[PDB]
Each structure stands twice: as structure tokens, then as C-alpha cells.
């Protein structure tokens, strides 16, 4: 599907026009090469005409007038032959002058050589300019990805933007790099050949160009015929992919219970069905070229027969007919895959307009380089009422206070708005009718990058990028050393299992080792956070997939022991955060109560409810 052809096309062009002189020079070289390549057959036909003249002028008696020879031939009969002689230019009795033939063929070969050289240099220049502009466009895409706010990514499908920035750029490449050369040469060739063949003979031009409406009609009809089968093939391949999904993802559950045979039978049935569907659809799609080839060849037959008839009449020369027989073939050449270029160009148009809409969105609000840093680690919140969309006050009138060096923790039900709070601390989303301060200064007056370089943050889920475990750990501070890396590793207890992996600190994390489960991925992530030596650590469910004992040891190691920094701890298990310098109880925003372990349990709050109810098994 497409929604803007002209606008996206002109934007794609204006992505290339900045070359200006280079672009116009490339266009000039291309058009000159096409024109001279069209001209070449004309001089070849002229040379063939000279040869044919010198051949059939031998049998006539020498010294006669051309009109006299025509009359002598016509008197004995040979009416068509007499017409041929009348319409053709021979002095009777004279042979071929090889000097003129040599001159003409030398001119032809020279112009062909310069045509090839110009075509090559034009191709090299177009490749250089398209690759340069393409690198610039991809760099702009990357820069925008660096500048975009988080709400843009969070408000769409997970694979949507990924396909828009990865696959659509490749489509842009495989579309424009092809078209701007081949389609441009095709259109220049068709214009040049049509004007030359119009200067040759008009009836021949009609007998040729009748194929264009026929070609477009037949390709449109074949496309409309194949579209239902193409959609069916798409649907059936989607069904096959989905079935492969649930038989591969739950492969252990398939090997257990012994259901390999049933899954194999279902797969075989749907695979055969998709085989038939793909067979039909692909046959109907691939039969486009033979049909237009036959239409062009029927046009060629008409050209040949009418050219023979007209040569017998004498209205035209043989060499012009030879040039025309060449020209009809070079005219047929583009139409064989003009539909292919059209569909590829339309796909590139759609991808280009999508990419441009991505590149024209709002960016971050030009963070002022205030460059504020923390000294003690005091935090403060003032009546923030943030919402993803107006009408859903997920955060509402919180006034939490934490002294520097405190390990204040928060408890609440899943989905109540914890991650929203930690994002607001990160300036991932702006504040709404609230004030937040670090060490007594508002963050909104502080540059975002300087803040984020000093916080230290881990999410509910882990993130890992292609590379070794050592690379993932060192991502926290690249200019550190392996001694520091292993020190942080021992601090985060990843060492207890990293040696169990095939090669410690060297396993490709994108290549799952099987033994690398979610909890130890969380350990890797928290180790990465540790290496950066943060002063405002926040633990947002970073220990969900790990045992409680490991959580208590690591917490006592790097938060309770590290009295020099304050910390936020978020966990769904109360015993994991018991005795952690006052605890907050938040229930879908609307922070309820605050206090230390004993004081908060003694006041019979919701914290007391959850501690009493869950441990006692009461429901």
C-alpha cells in the first residue's frame, strides 16, 4: 500500500539533488550515452545500405541511368523489383567502395567505444553519489533515533519501528540504487528510439507502439488474476510460520508427552498445502514476462512483414529496416521488466515516505547544558500527577522524602506505576504539575545527559546486546580494565556461574548457551550497573528472577554497606527489603503510607496486611 507518491518521490529526489552539478553531469552523461547508442544502429544501417547498393547494382548494365535501369527492368516485368530499384539509390554497374564502408564502420566503432566509456563513468558517478547520500540518510536516521523521546518508541508496536528503520532502509537501497540507473536508461532509451524511429517511418512506429497499451493491459490483468492467489499464499505461509512458532518455542513440551508425530503430521499437511498454494501463485506471478515477450514478438512480426512490403514498394531502404529491427528489440527490452521496476519503485516510495514521517517527528526539548551534579544524594517529590495520556492519572500527589545515604524502598501491586516513577526520575517522561529535585535542585533545570551519567538504573527486564559477557559488563564504563570488570563481577556474583559457561566472559550472549537463564541475565545487568559506580542507584525489580538469598547478599553488599550513596529498592517480596531505611506503600499511584519496617507493620497498614496475609497462607 502507498499513500503519497509525488511528495515522497520529490523528497527522495531532493535527498540526491544537493549534488547539483554532479547530478546534472550524471544525467548529461547518461542521456548522451543513450543518444549515441541509438544513433549507432542508424550508421550501421547506412553502411548495410551502401553494401546492398553495391551488391545489386552489379547485375545491371554499367553506365545506364537509374531511371533507365528501372524502365528496362519494368518493361520485361519485375514490377516489384522495378519499384525496389526506383526507390533505392544505385548507379548501375558500380561496385562497393570499401573506403566509404571502412569510414562508416570506423565511425560506428569509435562512437560505440565512447558510448561504453561514457556509460561506465556515468554508472560509477551514480553509484558514488547514491552511496554517499545513502550513508548520509542512514546517519540522519541514527541521529534521530538518538534524539527521539521515549514516548515515540513506547507508543507503537515493538517490531514496527524496528522494521521501519532496518528493513525499509534496505528496501530503499535495493529500490533506488536499481531504479535511478536502469529505469532512467530505459526511459531515455524509449524516448530516443521512438523519436529516431519516427524519423524513420510513422506506420512502423504505430505498428510497434500498439504493444504498449497491450503490455500494460496484460500485466494489469495478470496482476489482478494473481492477487487472490498471492494473498492466499501469504496467509498460508503465515500459518506455517505460526505453527513453527509454537512447535519450536515449546519444543521441550513437544519432546515431553511424545507429541512429535502429531505435530509432524500437521506440519506435513500444511506444508503440502502451502506447496500447492505457492506453486499456483508463483506460476501466475512468473508468467508475466512470457506474455509481454510474445506481444512484443508479434509486434516484431508485424514490423518485419510491413517492412518487407514497403521495401518491395521502395518507400524505404534496407538499412533503415535493419536499424528498425534493432530498434524494436531495444524498445522491447525495457517493457519486459517495466512492471518489476514499477512495483519496486512503489515499494521504495512507500518505505521512503514512512522513513520521512519517522524523521519528521518531534525531538527532545533541547536540554540546557546546566551541568548539575550530585554531592550528597537527597531526593524530593512534590505532587507529581504524570499520565501517559490525559485522563489516566497513574501518578498522583506523591511527596516522598529521602535523606542522602538512605536505602528507601517502595512496595506496590504489579502495574501500579512503579516503572513510570523510575522513568520520571530518569526524565524519560516529563513532569505533570509536579516538582522533583535532586539534592535540592530541580531536575527540569538540569541537563538530562549529565543527570543520567550519575544515576545508575536497572529495569524490571534485562537488556543485552550482541557480544561477549565481558563486553556487556564493560558497557557501563568502556575505559575501565579487566581487573575492575572481574571485581564488579565478583561483587555481583556472576562469577559463580560464568566459569560454568563454555568460555568465561567470552560467551556470545546473543548466542544462548542454554544455562543462561533470566535471573543470571539480571545479574549481568546489575553488574553492568555496578561498574559505573553510581551514586543514586535504583533497583526496579532487578532481582525478580533470582533467589531471595542472592538478593539479600548482593543488597547488603552494595547498597546497605555502601552508606556513601542513597538507593531505591523495588521488589515484590517484602523479606527482600525488610529493614531498608523506611518503606513506601504505593497503590496505583496515590502513595499511601511511609515508615520503617517495624513502625509500618505496627500501624496495621496495607503493608501489614500483605505481610500477614501472604506469610500465613490466608485468603
Amino acid at each position: 500500500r502507498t499513500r503519497d507518491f509525488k511528495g515522497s518521490a520529490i523528497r527522495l529526489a531532493r535527498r540526491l539533488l544537493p549534488q547539483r552539478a554532479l547530478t546534472l553531469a550524471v544525467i548529461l552523461l547518461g542521456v548522451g550515452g543513450i543518444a549515441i547508442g541509438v544513433i549507432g544502429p542508424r550508421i550501421l544501417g547506412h553502411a548495410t545500405d551502401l553494401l546492398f547498393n553495391g551488391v545489386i547494382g552489379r547485375e545491371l548494365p554499367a553506365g545506364l541511368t537509374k531511371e533507365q535501369a528501372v524502365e528496362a527492368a519494368r518493361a520485361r516485368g519485375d514490377g516489384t523489383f522495378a519499384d525496389l530499384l526506383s526507390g533505392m539509390d544505385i548507379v548501375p554497374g558500380q561496385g562497393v567502395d570499401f573506403g566509404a564502408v571502412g569510414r562508416t564502420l570506423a565511425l560506428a566503432l569509435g562512437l560505440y567505444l565512447v558510448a561504453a566509456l561514457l556509460v561506465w563513468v556515468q554508472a560509477r558517478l551514480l553509484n558514488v553519489t547514491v552511496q554517499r547520500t545513502m550513508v548520509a540518510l542512514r546517519a540522519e536516521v541514527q541521529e534521530k533515533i538518538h534524539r527521539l523521546p521515549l514516548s515515540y518508541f513506547d507508543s507503537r508496536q515493538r517490531g514496527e519501528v524496528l522494521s521501519r528503520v532496518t528493513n525499509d532502509v534496505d528496501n530503499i537501497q535495493n529500490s533506488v540504487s536499481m531504479t535511478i540507473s536502469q529505469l532512467l536508461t530505459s526511459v531515455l532509451t524509449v524516448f530516443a528510439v521512438l523519436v529516431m524511429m519516427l524519423t524513420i517511418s510513422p506506420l512502423l512506429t504505430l505498428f510497434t507502439v500498439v504493444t504498449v497499451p497491450a503490455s500494460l493491459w496484460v500485466t494489469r490483468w495478470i496482476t489482478r488474476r494473481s492477487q487472490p492467489l498471492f494473498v492466499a499464499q501469504w496467509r498460508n505461509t503465515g500459518r506455517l510460520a505460526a505453527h513453527l512458532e509454537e512447535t519450536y518455542s515449546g519444543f521441550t513440551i513437544v519432546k515431553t508427552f511424545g507429541h512429535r508425530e502429531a505435530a509432524a503430521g500437521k506440519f506435513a499437511e500444511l506444508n503440502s498445502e502451502t506447496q500447492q498454494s505457492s506453486f499456483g501463485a508463483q506460476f501466475f506471478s512468473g508468467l508475466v514476462s512470457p506474455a509481454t515477450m510474445f506481444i512484443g514478438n508479434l509486434s516484431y512480426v508485424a514490423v518485419a512483414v510491413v517492412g518487407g512490403l514497403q521495401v518491395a514498394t521502395g518507400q524505404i531502404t534496407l538499412g533503415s529496416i535493419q536499424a528498425f529491427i534493432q530498434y524494436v528489440r531495444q524498445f522491447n527490452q525495457p517493457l519486459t521488466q517495466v512492471a518489476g521496476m514499477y512495483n519496486t519503485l512503489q515499494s521504495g516510495i512507500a518505505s521512503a515516505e514512512r522513513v520521512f514521517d519517522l524523521l519528521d517527528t518531534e525531538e527532545e526539548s533541547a536540554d540546557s547544558p546546566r551541568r548539575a551534579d550530585v554531592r550528597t544524594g537527597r531526593v524530593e517529590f512534590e505532587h507529581v500527577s504524570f499520565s501517559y495520556v490525559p485522563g489516566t492519572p497513574v501518578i498522583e500527589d506523591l511527596s516522598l522524602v529521602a535523606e542522602p545515604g538512605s536505602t528507601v524502598a517502595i512496595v506496590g501491586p504489579t502495574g501500579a506505576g512503579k516503572t513510570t516513577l523510575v522513568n520520571l526520575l530518569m526524565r524519560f517522561y516529563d513532569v505533570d504539575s509536579g516538582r522533583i529535585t535532586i539534592d535540592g535542585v530541580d531536575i527540569a533545570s538540569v541537563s538530562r545527559e549529565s543527570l543520567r551519567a550519575s544515576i545508575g538504573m536497572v529495569l524490571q527486564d534485562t537488556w543485552l546486546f550482541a557480544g561477549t559477557i565481558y563486553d556487556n559488563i564493560a558497557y557501563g564504563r568502556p575505559d575501565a580494565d579487566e581487573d575492575e570488570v572481574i571485581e564488579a563481577a565478583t561483587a555481583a556474583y556472576v562469577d559463580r556461574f560464568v566459569h560454568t559457561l563454555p568460555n568465561g566472559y567470552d560467551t556470545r550472549v546473543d548466542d544462548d548457551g542454554g544455562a543462561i537463564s533470566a535471573g543470571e541475565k539480571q545479574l549481568i545487568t546489575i553488574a553492568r550497573a555496578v561498574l559505573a559506580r553510581p551514586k543514586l542507584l535504583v533497583l526496579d525489580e532487578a532481582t525478580s528472577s533470582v533467589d531471595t538469598r542472592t538478593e539479600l547478599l548482593i543488597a547488603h553488599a552494595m547498597a546497605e554497606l555502601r552508606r556513601d550513596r542513597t538507593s531505591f529498592i523495588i521488589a515484590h517480596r517484602l523479606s527482600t527489603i525488610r529493614d531498608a531505611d523506611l518503606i513506601l506503600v504505593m497503590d496505583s499511584g496515590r502513595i499511601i503510607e511511609r515508615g520503617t519496617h517495624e513502625e509500618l507493620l505496627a500501624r496495621h497498614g496495607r503493608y501489614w496486611e500483605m505481610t500477614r496475609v501472604h506469610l500465613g497462607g490466608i485468603k
Binding site: 553494401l51 546517519a139 513437544v254 518487407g308 519486459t336 551519567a453 546486546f465 556461574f497 528472577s545
Partner: protein, 574 residues
């Protein structure tokens, strides 16, 4: 490399019944396409020279007959080639799936689910795409050259030598270009995959990337990746720009030398004028076909890398199999005779599991607890023979598990994995996997046992309610409850629980354990968990750390026997 050709010559072998017909039809189509300008030229040679417009009109009738034969045989060739390519794709998909089903969990983790699926659904598609293109579009150029030389020989024994010497230099130039260009294309694909991986990793992070403020590093990494891709792009573009001009120049110089040599022989009377028209048409057909095929040829590196991946899948044979005559007790019960069990991946320093040993009587319930990374996760798979031990031995009913019938064992083992997964469909179908022929009341009783009858009854349409892939439509531990019901309908002699109870609350876990004791008292139960409350009531408990046992006994004895479990006790106490 040559992996693509090996896979082809192995798997398209049953389709020589069809590809030969495709080739024959392509040959006859191109021979007709070259017979077309031959009689076109004959029109000038005879009809024009004699002036007989009749000869022209019947030669036009023959013209139409030839082109009709060409189109019908060409469309037949395309039809049969499409059939052959689709059959090849179907056979490749079936073979890949059948071979990969023999894998264990080890190989599945080695390859990865998403990578495996994309390999088996898109790489095979690319391979069949290339097969159809080469059997319907690419082979035109070689057949075109062969037909051109053959028809030049047919026309005369003279001027044909110039065509016979002009075509091979074209072919050599094409081969020279492609030999250099192909490695550039494979490096192109490698860099494209790398940059796509970089983009995917960056977008997946975003939050963490902005948090650590590693913008300076990410920017330069993307810049260097794109610059390397640009260098490869320029390298490929050089040869691509060389491609068309050399072919065009070769055809043009062949044509000019053609006219130059033909004129001399025609002057002597050895050659006729129409042969020039025929030869020019032959060379232009050659140019069109060669350009078209070489332009389509850019698909080759895609098929090369796809074949490399498919060979990666197919070459790795499974290391787990029945030993061609295992024992069939058919009445196995709970023994689990772990004895000095050891397990370790190759190249690792510390083993996954080592020198552990424990046994359970026929109907007792045991559990294992410990810190994450201790290797307890793989112990369940070792019991169920998803992984084979390195040097240890664990026996069921006195005979080591590797000597058992693995199908019978899986029949007698009820397992809930740590990755609670459900197949797309309905509960009344996913739950069938425990028995495949269960009854509705049995399913409802299982939901009662799994402490899950409440919400499944709450659904308006009944227990036969739809589920998405992986149970993602559910809230969480509901999936674990469904897995428990699936396991319990089977009535297995041995129960395997792998941290499934962690996703549940204390009271629901207690109810589930009480139901299991009520129903499966005769059978044995093995539980993996990180929660003490789920393990307290077990008959015996074993605690493992760093892949070895650190404590065995009961909860009452172990709470004071070893400080290692006292760590868990203090961590869970309030």
C-alpha cells in the same frame, strides 16, 4: 562456498523428472526465438530480392506460427520450473523440520528458537526463489549462446567463425567480473546483517542506552559500521558499473566486425545480405539475455548464506538417542538413583553439576533448593534425559536412565518447565497433551487440583476458551497452573516441578501441594524452587551450591544443621 551446490545436487535429485523437461522447453523456446529472425532475414533474401509480396505474407504466417510455438513452450517451461522449485522447497522444509525434531534442548539452545524458525522459513524460501529464477530466467543466457552458435553454424560454414570467436570472450568477461564481484556481495550481506544487529540492539535498549549515556560510543560504532558498509558498497559498485559497458561494447564490436567481414564475402557472392540481419538479431538477443541473467544473478550470495545456515542445521546430528535396544520395564516407579552425577559443557572451568547423589523411595516427595546459578536448573533436564551426564550415573528402578526407552520414560514423566509455554488454540486442547484422549470431567478435576477451576469456570463459554501463543493472553502464574493440570491428568509415576510454583502465591501453592498429596500419594514428586515455604512439607530436601550438594535432610533438621540453608531461612524470615 560450495554448500549451496551440495544441498541442491542432494535435494533436487528427485526432480530430474521435471527440470530436464524445463530445460528442453527452454531450449526449444530460444531456438524458436532465433528461428524468428532467421526467417525474417529469409524474407529479405528471397521475398525482397524477387519482389514477391506473397512470399512475404506466407513467411509472415510462418513467423506467427514460430512465435506462437515459442510462447506456448516458454509458458510451459515456466509452469514446470515453478512446480519443480516449489517441490524442492517443500522437500527442503520437510527434511529440515524432520531433522531438527531429533534435536534435544541442548541443540535448541545452541541454535535458538527464533533463529531456527527464520532459518527454516525464510532461508529455504530464498533458496527456492533462486532455484526458480535460475531454471526460468537465468539459464536463458547460456542457452541463448548455444543456440546462437548452433544457428550461426546452420546458416553458413563461413562468417559463423566470427560469432564463434566473439561469444567466448563475452562469457570470459562475464566470468571475470562475477568472480571478483561475488565475495564483495557476501561481505555486503555480512555487513548488512551486522548493521541490522546493531540497530536492533540499540532500539531494544533505548532506555538503558540513554541511562548510561553511552551516546559517544554508540554514535562512533554506528559510524564505523556504516562506513565499512559504504566501503563494501563502493567496491561492489565498481564491478557493477563495469558490468554492462563491457557486454555492450563486446556486442557492438562483434556487430561492426560482423558487417565488415560480411561485406567482403557478399561482394565475392559467398554470402547473402539477409544473413547480416539474422546475425545482428542474434547478437541483440544475446545481449538482452546476458544482461538480464547477469542482473538477476545478484541473488546468488543470499542463497549462499542461506545454504550455509541450512548446512549448519543439517550437519549437527543429535547426541541423544535410544541405544538401539533399551530396557522396557513398563512398570517403572519413583527411584531416581542419582550417584556421583556430573555434568559440564566442553571448555568450561567449573562443571555444571558434580559429585551429587540422592535417592527417593517409590512414593516419596523430594525437593531441591539453592541459589541461582548453582546448576539446579539443569538437574531436572538431566533426570528427564534432556541432557546426558558427563561422567555420573542416575538410575530409575535400579537401571541407569540412558539404558531406558526414552519414549516410555517421557510417557511416564510429568514435567512442567521453567518456561511456562502454551500452544496456540484452547485450554481444552493444550491440556489434552497429558493424555490426548481425556474426558471433560477429568479436565475439570485437574483444574480443581491445579487450583485453577475458578477462573476457567468464570469464562462465559466454558473451559473450551481460546488461548494465544505461549499463553500470553493469561496474566502469569495462570499458565503455570495450566501446566500443572496438564501434568496431573497424565497421572505420571514421577512428577517433575521446575520453579513453576515460584510464579504462584503461598496459599495457592499450598493448596496445589495438598491436592497433589491427596491424588498422587502413590507417585513420587520432585520440586525445584527458590522459596522455602514450598519445600518445608517435602519428605526430604537437598541443598546444592556451586554444582554440588551442601546439605541433605529434612527442613526441621536442616534449619539448624547447615548455615547455608540458614541463609535462606533468615532471608525469608521477617
Amino acid at each position: 562456498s560450495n554448500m549451496l551446490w551440495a544441498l541442491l545436487r542432494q535435494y533436487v535429485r528427485p526432480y530430474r523428472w521435471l527440470l530436464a523437461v524445463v530445460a528442453v522447453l527452454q531450449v526449444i523456446s530460444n531456438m524458436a526465438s532465433l528461428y524468428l529472425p532467421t526467417v525474417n532475414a529469409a524474407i529479405i533474401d528471397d521475398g525482397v530480392a524477387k519482389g514477391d509480396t506473397a512470399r512475404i505474407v506466407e513467411l509472415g504466417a510462418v513467423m506467427l506460427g514460430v512465435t506462437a510455438l515459442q510462447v506456448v513452450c516458454a509458458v510451459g517451461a515456466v509452469f514446470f520450473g515453478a512446480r519443480a522449485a516449489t517441490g524442492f522447497g517443500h522437500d527442503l522444509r520437510a527434511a529440515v523440520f524432520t531433522h531438527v525434531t531429533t534435536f534435544s534442548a541442548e541443540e535448541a539452545g545452541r541454535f535458538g528458537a527464533a533463529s531456527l524458525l527464520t532459518r527454516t522459513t525464510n532461508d529455504v524460501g530464498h533458496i527456492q526463489q533462486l532455484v526458480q529464477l535460475t531454471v526460468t530466467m537465468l539459464i536463458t543466457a547460456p542457452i541463448m549462446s548455444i543456440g546462437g552458435i548452433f544457428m550461426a553454424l546452420h546458416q553458413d560454414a563461413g562468417l559463423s567463425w566470427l560469432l564463434l570467436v566473439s561469444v567466448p570472450v563475452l562469457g570470459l568477461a562475464n566470468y571475470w567480473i562475477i568472480r571478483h564481484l561475488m565475495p564483495v556481495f557476501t561481505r555486503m550481506q555480512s555487513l548488512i546483517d551486522g548493521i541490522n544487529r546493531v540497530l536492533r540492539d540499540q532500539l531494544s535498549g533505548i532506555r538503558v542506552i540513554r541511562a548510561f549515556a553511552r551516546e559517544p560510543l554508540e554514535r562512533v560504532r554506528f559510524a564505523e559500521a556504516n562506513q565499512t558498509l559504504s566501503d563494501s558498497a563502493l567496491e561492489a559498485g565498481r564491478w557493477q558499473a563495469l558490468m554492462l559497458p563491457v557486454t555492450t561494447l563486446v556486442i557492438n564490436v562483434s556487430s561492426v566486425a560482423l558487417i565488415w567481414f560480411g561485406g567482403l564475402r557478399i561482394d565475392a557472392g559467398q554470402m547473402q545480405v539477409g544473413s547480416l540481419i539474422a546475425f545482428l538479431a542474434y547478437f541483440m538477443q544475446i545481449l538482452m539475455a546476458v544482461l538480464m541473467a547477469t542482473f538477476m544473478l545478484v541473488i546468488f550470495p543470499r542463497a549462499a548464506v542461506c545454504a550455509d545456515r541450512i548446512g549448519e542445521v543439517l550437519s549437527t546430528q543429535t547426541a541423544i538417542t535410544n541405544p538401539a535396544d533399551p530396557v522396557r520395564p513398563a512398570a517403572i516407579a519413583g527411584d531416581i538413583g542419582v550417584h556421583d552425577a556430573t555434568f559440564c559443557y566442553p571448555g568450561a572451568d567449573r562443571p555444571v553439576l558434580q559429585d551429587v547423589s540422592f535417592t527417593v523411595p517409590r512414593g516419596t516427595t523430594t525437593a531441591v533448593v539453592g541459589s541461582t546459578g548453582s546448576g539446579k536448573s539443569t538437574l531436572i533436564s538431566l533426570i528427564c534425559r534432556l541432557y546426558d551426564v558427563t561422567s555420573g550415573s542416575l538410575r530409575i528402578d535400579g537401571v541407569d536412565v540412558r539404558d531406558l526407552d526414552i519414549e516410555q520414560l517421557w510417557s511416564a514423566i510429568g514435567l512442567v518447565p521453567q518456561r511456562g509455554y502454551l500452544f496456540s488454540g484452547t485450554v481444552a486442547e493444550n491440556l489434552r497433551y497429558g493424555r490426548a484422549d481425556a474426558t471433560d470431567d477429568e479436565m475439570w478435576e485437574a483444574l480443581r487440583v491445579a487450583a485453577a477451576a475458578d477462573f476457567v469456570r468464570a469464562h462465559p463459554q466454558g473451559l473450551d476458551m481460546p488461548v494465544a501463543q505461549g499463553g500470553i493472553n493469561f496474566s502469569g502464574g495462570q499458565r503455570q497452573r495450566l501446566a500443572i493440570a496438564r501434568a496431573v491428568i497424565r497421572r505420571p509415576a514421577i512428577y517433575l516441578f521446575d520453579d513453576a510454583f515460584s510464579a504462584l502465591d503461598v496459599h495457592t501453592d499450598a493448596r496445589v501441594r495438598d491436592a497433589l498429596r491427596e491424588v498422587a500419594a502413590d507417585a513420587t514428586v520432585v520440586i525445584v524452587s527458590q522459596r522455602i515455604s514450598t519445600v518445608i512439607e517435602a519428605d526430604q530436601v537437598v541443598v546444592i551450591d556451586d554444582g554440588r550438594v551442601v546439605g541433605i535432610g529434612t527442613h526441621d533438621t536442616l534449619l539448624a544443621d547447615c548455615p547455608i540453608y540458614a541463609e535462606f531461612a533468615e532471608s525469608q524470615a521477617l
